[PDB]
């Protein structure tokens with residue numbers, strides 16, 4: 001039985017209503033729950049969903065050099081596959097493998113409706129509206145590593161901001177936007193942003209274009225016999241239009257705004 | 258010296274003005290020429306650009322089972338790397354390797370301005386306007402393999418259309434659109450469609466959303482020592498914003514419309 005690391009993130013992995021009464025994998029629903037089922041069917045494996053204990057995507061400690069989050073679970077052999085909205089990055093590719101992308105996305109800006117912001121330049125040239133990102137993920141790293149002037153300005157602000165503009169989870173960032181009367185904006189991937197925009201109370205929206213262009217991949221530890229089957233499975237699902245059906249199912253069919 | 262297979266396709270690889278006076282690689286300019294230079298710099302290789310002899314992207318002969326085009330050049334050891342708008346697909350992944358995507362795209366519809374078509378459904382429910390794709394590529398295969406009703410109908414038409422609706426090159430498809438007074442539409446990737454829309458005489462446009470979501474990758478033959486360095490190089494260029502800069506350079510800085 002293959003241990004699948006994933007993260008509680010709507011609409012990828014969520015608790016079913018009355019999840020307490022279900023056992024194991026049956027506790028959960030979402031895009032990545034369906035993707036896990038599809039891949040397992042294609043490659044012929046039994047699997048168990050294990051929600052990442054620390055609740056993080058994955059970053060390397062510049063102190064102890066230890067990987068946390070889902071990346072950590074793979075690196076240290078606690079899980080055999082990661083089926084979550086895990087961004088394909090250089091630093092991660094150096095320690096784990098990724099399938100070709102199952103979803104295409106970029107960093108985006110979330111505002112409370114009515115906020116006078118339409119771009120990253122708009123954010124960077126003012127101080128009245130605060131903004132941040134989730135911790136321990138690719139978005140925080142993006143700003144840390146950027147040599148593009150606008151993003152460097154944004155990082156210089158966010159890195160030193162008090163109280164902290166970095167949130168433990170995406171949900172916490174969204175809640176912060178919703179409660180802050182337009183005085184907090186949140187930087188997050190377009191996929192999560194677009195989802196939230198179609199959820200009650202319909203008070204947030206994505207503004208401007210994406211800051212970058214990248215993808216989520218299904219990840220496996222280096223040397224895994226699952227590497228190739230997983231990659232081919234993702235491409236088959238892509239080409240058969242199943243990934244498009246799954247996105248429509250979890251983002252728009254369920255649309256509430 | 259590494260042989261780089263590529264294809265004459267604007268704005269990826271084009272002849273410089275007065276190309277006859279230049280030698281070797283310096284005869285050429287474009288997105289993929291710049292990408293080749295960037296990758297070679299990162300991975301420390303000397304290279305020679307060789308335009309694919311048969312002028313094809315790459316498909317397998319359901320008869321001889323022989324791969325043609327750039328895929329063929331890699332499969333049969335005539336080239337060591339492909340740096341071109343070559344789509345990452347299942348069938349190709351079974352015989353060659355691809356880097357993670359350097360560009361994201363989908364199949365799209367090109368029309369002569371004023372053509373009463375705004376979608377794939379619009380095309381499929383009529384017969385007055387003909388439509389086709391380029392031969393020996395991923396777009397033709399998409400329609401061949403689709404089980405989506407609208408696309409199945411389009412394939413059933415295109416496969417048996419007289420005279421042939423399939424063109425040898427993208428340029429031939431574009432010229433056919435331009436010359437046909439709204440009676441021909443062309444199915445091609447969004448990237449090439451978007452490019453053409455900003456080129457004189459500014460008589461074409463992209464209509465509707467993309468039919469799929471996929472990527473171009475830099476390809477290497479199975480067992481190549483260049484596989485990992487090329488993959489990491491693409492991700493480095495992605496993350497440094499170089500891919501975005503190159504797209505802006507060749508599509509929009511170079512806009513005529």
Ligand SMILES: N[C@@H](CCC(=O)O)C(=O)O
Nearest residue numbers: 057085086087137138139
């Ligand atoms: N998909 C991101 C998580 C969210 C973010 O950082 O925006 C990652 O893999 O780290």
Ligand SMILES: N[C@@H](CCC(=O)O)C(=O)O
Nearest residue numbers: 314342343344394395396
């Ligand atoms: N990018 C395509 C070429 C053109 C097409 O088929 O649309 C390929 O690699 O085959």
